[PDB]
Amino acid sequence: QFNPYGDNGGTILGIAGEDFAVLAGDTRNITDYSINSRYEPKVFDCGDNIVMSANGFAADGDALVKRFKNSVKWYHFDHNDKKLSINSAARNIQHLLYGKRFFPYYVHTII
Amino acid sequence: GTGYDLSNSVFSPDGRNFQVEYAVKAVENGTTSIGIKCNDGVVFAVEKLITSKLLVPQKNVKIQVVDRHIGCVYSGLIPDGRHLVNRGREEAASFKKLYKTPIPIPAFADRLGQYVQAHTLYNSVRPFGVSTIFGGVDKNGAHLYMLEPSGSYWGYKGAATGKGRQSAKAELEKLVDHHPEGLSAREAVKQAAKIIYLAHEDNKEKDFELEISWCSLSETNGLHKFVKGDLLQEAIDFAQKEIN
Amino acid sequence: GSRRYDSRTTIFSPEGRLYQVEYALESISHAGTAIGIMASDGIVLAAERKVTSTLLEQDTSTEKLYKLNDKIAVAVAGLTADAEILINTARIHAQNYLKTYNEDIPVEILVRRLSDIKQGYTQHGGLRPFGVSFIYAGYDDRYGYQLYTSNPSGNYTGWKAISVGANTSAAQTLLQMDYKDDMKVDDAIELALKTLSKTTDSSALTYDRLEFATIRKGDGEVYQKIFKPQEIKDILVKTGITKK
Amino acid sequence: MDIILGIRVQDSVILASSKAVTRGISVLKDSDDKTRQLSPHTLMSFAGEAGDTVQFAEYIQANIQLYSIREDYELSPQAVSSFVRQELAKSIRSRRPYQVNVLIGGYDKKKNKPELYQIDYLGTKVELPYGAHGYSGFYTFSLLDHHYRPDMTTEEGLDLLKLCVQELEKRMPMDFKGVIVKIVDKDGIRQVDDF
Amino acid sequence: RNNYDGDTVTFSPTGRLFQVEYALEAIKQGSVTVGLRSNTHAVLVALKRNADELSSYQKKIIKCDEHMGLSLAGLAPDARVLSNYLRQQCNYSSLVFNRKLAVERAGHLLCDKAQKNTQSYGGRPYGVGLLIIGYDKSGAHLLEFQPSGNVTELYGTAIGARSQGAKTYLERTLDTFIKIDGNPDELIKAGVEAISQSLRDESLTVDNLSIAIVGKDTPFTIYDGEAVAKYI
Amino acid sequence: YDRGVSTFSPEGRLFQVEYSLEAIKLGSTAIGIATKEGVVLGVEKRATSPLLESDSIEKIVEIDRHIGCAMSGLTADARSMIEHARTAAVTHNLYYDEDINVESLTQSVCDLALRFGEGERLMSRPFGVALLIAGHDADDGYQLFHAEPSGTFYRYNAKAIGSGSEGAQAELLNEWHSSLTLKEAELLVLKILKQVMEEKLDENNAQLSCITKQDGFKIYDNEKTAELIKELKEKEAAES
Amino acid sequence: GYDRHITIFSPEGRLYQVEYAFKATNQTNINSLAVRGKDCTVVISQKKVPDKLLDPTTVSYIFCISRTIGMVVNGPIPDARNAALRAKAEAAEFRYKYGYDMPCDVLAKRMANLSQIYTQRAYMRPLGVILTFVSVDEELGPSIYKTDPAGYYVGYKATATGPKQQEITTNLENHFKKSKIDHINEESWEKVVEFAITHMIDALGTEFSKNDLEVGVATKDKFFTLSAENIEERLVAIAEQD
Amino acid sequence: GYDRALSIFSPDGHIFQVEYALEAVKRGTCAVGVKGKNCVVLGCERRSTLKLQDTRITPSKVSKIDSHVVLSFSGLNADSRILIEKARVEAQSHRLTLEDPVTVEYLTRYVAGVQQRYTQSGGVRPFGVSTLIAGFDPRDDEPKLYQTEPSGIYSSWSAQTIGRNSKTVREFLEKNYDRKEPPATVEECVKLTVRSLLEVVQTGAKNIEITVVKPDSDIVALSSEEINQYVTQIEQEKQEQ
Amino acid sequence: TDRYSFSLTTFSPSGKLGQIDYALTAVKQGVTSLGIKATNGVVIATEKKSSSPLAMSETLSKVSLLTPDIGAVYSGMGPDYRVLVDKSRKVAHTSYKRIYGEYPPTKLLVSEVAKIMQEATQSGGVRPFGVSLLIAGHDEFNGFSLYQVDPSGSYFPWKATAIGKGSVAAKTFLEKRWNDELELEDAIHIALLTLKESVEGEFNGDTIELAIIGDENPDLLGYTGIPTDKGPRFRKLTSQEINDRLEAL
Ligand SMILES: [Mg+2]
After folding, report:
1. Chain B interface includes I3 (CB < 8 A)
2. Residue span of the structural domain in which B100 resides
3. Residue F234 CB contacts under 8 Å (≥ 6 apart), including other chains
4. D120: number of CA atoms within 13 Å, CB side?
5. Where does G1-241 sit in CATH, by number?
6. By the CB < 8 Å criterion, does H173 face chain F?
């Protein structure tokens, strides 16, 4: 039987300050007990001053990050380049995730 | 009765489809494009009307490539030619996928012909407003074909369509009579340049830009390549020297 | 395209009439006359065969009267084939109601379903309507004996006595003259035969030129009888329309 | 789990439905009415899987009321039971079948007769003098087999139902929090105040 | 009068497609917009039309990707549809191939999308002309798109009412503006002079002017309002 | 019937679009004025009989709490557009936890306008109704858009549609200034309505509403409109 | 009015589009005939190549449908190739579904049913072609079956199609009246080809070179088309014939 | 399959099919609706030559949509049947999903939306039907009377007529209906409605139907004898001249 | 791209269905074909008008077997009749034999063919069939029967009738020559006499097509061993039998 999921390790961490926020992630990508890459970044700038990271299954995380970047691109397209607020991005990501409620993204997400 | 020419796929009392002939009229009003079958390949040439000097030269390409061995040029409504070339590319792709070998020129010709002819069976679609000269080299050698808006296609030693199709055809005919042994690839390229320059007289009001491609078994290894660079200038010089 | 040949069958006239419905009613006006009469203890359907000949077998012929179930019959006026299509759908709907509720379908429900089927063709689909008028004679526990009519528009109405087809004005005048509420089924048979003999287009009214049916209560059940040619001849000689 | 009981006497039908709704180890409700009035003289009690029951019952009620408004005529209890049996027999072979068992009690005004039907989630319909759905049957049937008379009055039927409910409260292992009792007769459907 | 202008599936006896010609005429009645390019940049200038003095000068420049955009003349809805198609094609290229869509390929795709409407019964050709600017791996590019399907690469052109004035202006100024490499302001000024050459009884203001620039080290940007004030 | 719904005129226009505009010209008058203190929308109710209860003449609808709409023409065709706009606004709020931009709402509405022809299933004809979409968002403030069945939409400081719209536009051109206040806008809308109305303007045949950043979109009841009418009568009476 | 443009009935009960398709069949001004031998079937057709720029080898109106069935078409070459592709597809599908090669008459009936469909449905125009199928069926012997745009199909002892059709028809009738048999009593197919060419030059009244004819021969379990050199051989043997 | 645009615009800005449907409504039997102080009366004209027609089984012009809401019409009866079926199904659906019966305004809006969709869809013609929808909202005693046209327009009315000679009856109602003093008793409303009908009927009670709607789902159609009582009272008050 | 989703057969203001009347016109111009019912069988005959004498007559089969007890002949457009015969043979299996194990009775098969034709007179983008059929059949519970089916989809049962050009003349003949005591051989004789008047050309077995629905033919069954499996009642007469019956006139 084919298992459509995998674990690629890693760890991310976000902390909010008074007028700043930080999103950090380790640059290690692994499979089982092998190191796939010692530098494979998983925290990404998505524009509109929003950083995002989906950690867990590297394929699902890359797919989710791509979909959210495309979502911000088309949000600019459809709303006169309106800045995507952090809460608007969070809600749009809730809908992106729940779209696969029955084939989930095996990732924990932090923006 | 009357009114037979208003709808497509309607037979007139003389057995004609007038919409197809109107498409042919639209074809004849297009720029000149020719094809020459030589001993081991084919050459295609086309006149590009430089409406103004704001047009970027060497761009706005008209000759299209199907697979890696088929060359197609057309006279008439350029968008219909692009549509037909896209359909032919899909046909060649499916043929390669199923039968592994690249599609032979007669097979590709019949694909295009069936498509164009099907576009003359229903009043819900418009006939194709292009004439197409295509061909290339397959396992059986070199093949040149011309396909009309009716879906009728034939194999040609040389073909021409567009405004200057008359003179060009005549010139082409002389070629067939002058060398029954055949032309070489570069000779056919230079001759196509000359023939395009000669057929430009029927469109002498606007300036023109020559465009030549070829598919030769020895010169291009069976692949379809645009004649560019030094060979293009050599053919242009041969044509210009032939005019004066 | 193809819209030029579209007759646009479901459009309104500037007076608010459906062209095809009116023309189909005009068609039905030339069909053989059919009469239904609802007596106090039965219902009678009579109809004239427009198609008649010396070589036409009548024993195996059913042109105007049809069984829908065991308690409902129809007299048809117009295109017999459209009538058969509608009759098949009506029989199927009656059996559907039976399978669903384990009860015989009330006559008005069947009439309304068939009339809705007719109306659908007059509002969408771009098809011609059904050139058929129906006279439904039925029995149910809720309303007793019931007599309905439905024309190509999808409209249906209930009558004590009614006629469809040819010479509806004359037949309706005669029925309005000679109909009384307390009459019995035999009196209704007599009145139907008399009206058909007075409004027929033929010389005399013969047995081979008629179809006859009676839905009556004779034993605690209702019996549906489609008259055979001999029964028609007998009932004709009994009311004094024929001899022998 | 749920108790669905029905006794058809001489002049009426009586339906008893357990009041308890339980999910997990919690009795969420103790006053639930497991019946829907399909028509002024036709009532239906139901039991089975959560959600399926009320969904199916209200769907049936919608269709019956639509019929009544369309024809200005009240369907007989037999026709209503046939419609419900067709619906269940179609559902049993669909993607997600309705897991509902129903009792249908009506007073046919034409026959002037009480009718009681029992239908299960498969589409198995029977007309019975007394019916019961689920494990409650295993106690009630025999009891009625001994005490039921066809000529009983509605008060006698109510005493008989009291006997049945007492037996279920005594021997059944689940607390169904009493029963709601309803009577369907020529005058319509009423609910017994206290039982 | 003419029985050959009923639809796009009817050829005239001359061989013409009158519905396509009426789409072209819908362009010619549209407002004027000009485009030009050098070897490092490409500019679109757009005189946005207003319904009246209380109206807003309608949006005439649409961005398709960080490296490509267009200006329109004609039916704004059809330009919305075609621009959305172009955005989706650029998006498909970027997502599936990690590749910026070449301007030539975008022109080919628009040509095919437009031809699909000139050969089928039901529906019409698009009543818009589009000027497409873009900087890609091949340099700067300007494309003219017509409802006929013909897409052509140019150094400069203009479409809309009285566009021949700007067209001849660029024909004379070709050798001038082609060689302005690395100075976007001069390209914008040349384009503004061109679009002024195609206006009669009018004058460019802040409200009726739209500029768009894309080129080397310059993402596709639109200047509206006071941003164009520097160009009168 | 001798053409097609998506057929071009020799001058480059869509026949059905122009015909729908001509049909809109026959509708009730609807005027909108956009200020810096809000936007005002007024409509002529136009009763066809004294028995018709003028309260049930809904020509001003709420798209969202911050966006209102006024219709003119075949108001029956508007209903579907109103539903599309309401669902679009609520769906944008659902996906993004924010109010939809007024231009975005108008653009989604106009997406329907040219969604007609013979197809893949579309409407048979364009809409026979024009819309004045007034609203407020934080990006462009107060906005008033005119949405045509041609799929095009414009923004206006003030705009009049319907029967007496032509002559109304000129009047707006005379009386609109950038520093216009909300009360002046209400009074001006009532004035132009009374001028273009075929009967004496009162609260029963004229409806007023506004969009303010503070209180959202509110339709004025009959009493507020009647008081505004009395105030307009007083202001105009003291002029020569 | 419009009853002349789509395949519906005129008030005289005629389908004018079908008649105009029959008219379109003669657009090519090419004649053909087909004859049956003792154990073979020959089709002769005219090969008219007007343009000198044409590749003569690709100018053909004879098609190899299957390994046993050949088809010669009188009509425009687009509709000819349409019908040829459909017939090849139908023959392959028949062999696949029923395990034996499609009989000539069955393929003729199939194409005739498709033609009838075109004459009854208004969305599709009739094909302006007359199809003559030749084969040596394992159950019927040498077989010639012709189908027309009207949907008719019929077998022939011999046949001819084209502008001079009637003349060739009469010639063949007369020969078969003289010989009193329904075929050519010759064992070799070359002689049957010779007979067909002889009678075609007699009916048309013009001589033929090797580049003016197209010859298709069907023998048991084979259908082929003669080359220009083999046609020239037949012409040489005819010239020597008295 | 058939998607031909039948309802299209004319150069003068008209949808000719909708207006022709209105014409079809103009030739139908007359229907009247009058709002009382606490009731709604719907009157209808029957076609003549009913001497052999069976009034027992024939469908009446006033059809019940729900226990509390009724609908009458003018135009083609078959289209009205289709609309009534849709309306009854939607009323049951609204009961099922909202746990509250339809309001007269919501049912009216649904019917008008169906009619509009039929005037905007390809391959279909508009309904040759205009409707009067009357009743009382659930747990409300304020009468509601709405009218819908083939175009999809709907509006409330204190009283309104549709059908043949509806201009005459509408003028009569405009003359004799005072909004300040609506008919207080049910009797006054039924009398006003039967007078409005008699203005055009010119026959008698035999071609007049009257259905009264009172709150809490009380709906009753008067038999021919009560209609004859009203007609005889009207003619007696007519005789004085 | 089938955009013809509308009726091509509509009511004219006079009430006529124009395409149906024109199809009847096409039928009336067809070669005469007749049918005669006897007490022990039915006979159906027609003329095999061949355009060229080079055409093989056996291929021009105008009488076609539908079921082992039901055959058909026509007047009108050959190809319409051919596709109708194919549809009828198919529906005899799909709609009856595969459901009840027995072939359909004559009336049911005739009504199915009639339904096909009526659909052809109302469906979108189609003309009516340009043929009229005479279907002769035998079933166990109705005996022998002869039906006529028109382009309109209407079918009628005939003791005997004819359709085509000489129809009127033939019917007069049949009317004055038919009686309910007729024999199958006498019916064949009357059919030959009636066709002899409607045909201008040669009159032999090769120029006429004639078939019968008579007794069962066990020799035509193909297998023996099932006493209940009766032979087929439809039998097409050979040219030799037709000539043998012609020589004694
Ligand atoms: Mg056709």
Report:
1. yes
2. 1-244
3. none
4. 8
5. 3.60.20.10
6. yes
